[PDB]
Design a protein around this ligand. Structure first.
Ligand SMILES: Cc1cc2nc3c(=O)[nH]c(=O)nc-3n(C[C@H](O)[C@H](O)[C@H](O)COP(=O)(O)O)c2cc1C
Ligand SMILES: Cc1cc2nc3c(=O)[nH]c(=O)nc-3n(C[C@H](O)[C@H](O)[C@H](O)COP(=O)(O)O)c2cc1C
Ligand SMILES: Cc1cc2nc3c(=O)[nH]c(=O)nc-3n(C[C@H](O)[C@H](O)[C@H](O)COP(=O)(O)O)c2cc1C
Ligand SMILES: Cc1cc2nc3c(=O)[nH]c(=O)nc-3n(C[C@H](O)[C@H](O)[C@H](O)COP(=O)(O)O)c2cc1C
Lengths: 173, 173, 173, 173
């Protein structure tokens, strides 16, 4: 019914955010209230100094609470998720994703770090008590032909995105 | 509705198996067809030398394929799942858990090894292409009052098993 | 000969930093040039927006290059290292720890997350090509009796610290 | 100087074993006493049913204890080390690798599973109390030109093995 999408790259434009964009598009047809957030909606001072009286944190935290699902995207940095993304996750309440379906998306420079999603990001999402976590979609940088403007992907990436998004849509019932 | 239960303990009875026995009991209550497998169903030489023509592997494989969901249980050895269970997972086809809901259970000598589920078992189950992986249940040995004659758990662990099984049943629609 | 120490908690005072403090003390006797850094030496805007033209980054990056070793401390947040710490690590060059001995220290609220060091922090340090990574020291919050003033630890924690620091000192030759 | 080499592959000859054979050869060149073990030294039933009275386990254990360092090699199965190797690691005493330098080697069908070394194998070796764990070497199968009759590697992989072995030898002082 409601879905939070969360872009986790500190950079803009972002290759991994182009994956969230295609997802957002897909849902915006199916009349689902999609609330999109990126790191630029928070004050860097709040995230870095772990400040829970953050006003932006509160609004986000509120909107998450009412969400049925989360789609979250990260670049791979040093074989794991972005630090930047993590600093926000660290401010969520202990059971923040209790009862929600979670779909993780990632882009990375090398195929050699495909496993960063399963080994690094999923356990954090799980510590936040995600009720179920989908297989997810990792894409190396060669899969994204264009993102500065409209996202363009190889049919392989697009198809895998499609499949995941279909599974997520079903799981939200 | 078909579910496979898979005991990953090298000994029998085990603490981790008592969790599956309790699971079996609750799912039979709902007219799910439950099929139990343990490591004692395979010849040690077939698993330890990765022999793909193992007759039991072919039977397990046909059974898994027809199954809608999998509950797998392991003890926690050296900060991970058991090698023993892993010998069998290594012999399954590449997409063996595609289209399937997976619930992982585990028991551990110390709470210090709780992260073994998220950081070690889950990524293996995801390499097999599990469609979705539930939060799961970890119990340190002190929560399993009896695993020999009748599964008996502390109230907290029994409540967490029930919450997990209810989520797992709902997922199978 | 030279050692970087790096406090990774966004908070001050810090329980995990008290572990670095005892380490710093230990080395300051043995005439080793110890360069200490915490996250407060960087601008939160630089870390969050991934800015490599950071002046503080340069100085740190320079001092690391000449260091024989790194001792790094993190609180456990959401079953992994701090996001805050990670945002700095993400700005280091790809082979930043090539040729260095690395000792990781951590404090966490629950024993249940002892494995966050080995499963989450070590692989990042390794992606940065640490030449060798020591076993490390994890301490749950009950081990630290006092840190607002002088650090006070249980003899168990202190002894394990001692042992690790001895091993690190030897490895720096 | 005593080193144990331990082949974790369930088949022989294996790609991962060719790395150890090359290692053996280089260390004998330096009058290190090298002791090679593989899974074929143990009875499959002892490993798969965790039987502690395995005579070979007692011999391996005495040998490990007297050893200064360990080089262990595994193929990468389902995003991790082999279950087969893990069955043997599960049977070693709690502090088996205390006081020891460990070098991990691995080979994989795809570069996509490179993180199996850091995210899966290393935490197991650290649960055994390895004093220090070197960066190690991962090679995808395409880097091993021959493992049957004479180990032959691409120049890049041979250079990385040499760098690792030189670090390992230096560590043994
Ligand atoms: C600071 C930084 C660190 C990176 N480290 C890795 C890495 O460890 N492994 C990898 O495969 N790619 C690495 N890359 C490449 C990115 O993960 C890749 O280009 C990704 O698509 C960027 O996504 P984004 O546009 O959303 O930032 C790194 C990139 C940056 C900027
Ligand atoms: C060979 C062996 C190794 C073990 N290593 C660990 C360990 O590393 N960490 C831990 O928490 N418990 C360890 N234990 C204890 C088991 O995790 C715990 O007692 C478990 O519940 C036994 O489960 P089972 O009866 O299903 O086999 C080990 C037990 C055995 C037999
Ligand atoms: C934002 C936040 C998240 C935390 N999450 C966890 C956690 O997942 N697991 C845990 O054991 N402790 C958790 N804790 C407790 C801390 O890890 C623990 O109190 C630690 O000693 C703090 O160290 P520091 O003073 O250096 O910040 C968390 C604490 C904070 C402030
Ligand atoms: C049962 C089995 C499972 C495998 N699964 C994977 C895998 O999940 N990921 C991967 O990268 N390679 C996988 N492979 C390929 C091996 O990782 C690769 O070919 C390896 O180098 C074989 O090493 P070995 O000859 O030392 O046994 C698998 C091979 C076998 C026999």
């Amino acid at each position: 019914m409601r879905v939070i999408t969360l872009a986790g790259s500190p950079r803009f434009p972002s290759r991994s955010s182009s994956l969230l964009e295609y997802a957002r598009e897909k849902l915006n047809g199916l009349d689902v209230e999609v609330y999109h957030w990126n790191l630029q909606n928070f004050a860097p001072e709040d995230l870095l100094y772990a400040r829970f009286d953050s006003p932006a944190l509160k609004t986000f935290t509120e909107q998450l609470q009412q969400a049925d699902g989360l789609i979250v995207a990260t670049p791979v940095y040093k074989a794991a998720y972005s630090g930047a993304l993590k600093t926000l996750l660290d401010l969520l309440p202990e059971r923040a994703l209790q009862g929600k379906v979670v779909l993780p998306l990632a882009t990375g420079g090398t195929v050699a770090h495909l496993l960063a999603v399963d080994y690094a990001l999923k356990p954090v999402l799980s510590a936040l008590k995600a009720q179920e976590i989908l297989h997810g979609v990792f894409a190396d940088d060669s899969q994204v032909i264009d993102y500065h403007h409209r996202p363009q992907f190889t049919p392989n990436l697009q198809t895998r995105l499609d499949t995941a998004l279909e599974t997520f849509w079903q799981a939200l019932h």
